[PDB]
UniProtKB/Swiss-Prot annotation:
This released fragment is important for agrin signaling and to exert a maximal dendritic filopodia-inducing effect. All 'B' splice variants of this fragment also show an increase in the number of filopodia. Ca(2+) binds at D63, L80, Q130, D132. The record marks K1, A2 as: Cleavage, beta site. The record marks S26 as: Alternative splice site to produce 'B' isoforms. Disulfide bonds join C162-C188. The gene is AGRN. Residues 19-188 form the Laminin G-like domain. This is Agrin C-terminal 22 kDa fragment.
Amino acid sequence: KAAGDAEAIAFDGRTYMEYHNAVTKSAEPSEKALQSNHFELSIKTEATQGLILWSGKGLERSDYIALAIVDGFVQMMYDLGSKPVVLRSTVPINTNHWTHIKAYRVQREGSLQVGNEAPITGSSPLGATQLDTDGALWLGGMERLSVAHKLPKAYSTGFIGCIRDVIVDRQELHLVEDALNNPTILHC
Ligand SMILES: [Ca+2]
């Protein structure tokens, strides 16, 4: 919890924070064509289903990369415009112990490592290599859930648990201060 070194934020199932890719070298409107994505974070949970993170514009047509707990295991999913790929971890996540997650994508190639497992790798189908996004990022849940009807129920399920030390594209997130949607703040 935010009361001893690492500030850990609690998520109650309705909690979700919006952030914007506000840190650089990791104008006006338009979009971004990202070659890569890098996510690192630690979570603590008893949940067997839940959306951890969603990066993308959040429209039905939009590209996305997301982390979710699906049937007790963290998985990464992304669709860059040539259909999605899923990378599924082998580490039970719902132990209620702080667990590290490292997930990244370079063009079509993805990697997911929970704890000390051998990284799970895979690639989205040949074609698109860039994630077209406005830079929006949601943690613990999502505003626009309709863009989850095409996915496992976990993606429409708010995360219940705690999160700390979130690093997005080489920048440590200030979970409380960086949040843009005035969420209800609770510590772990
Ligand atoms: Ca794309």
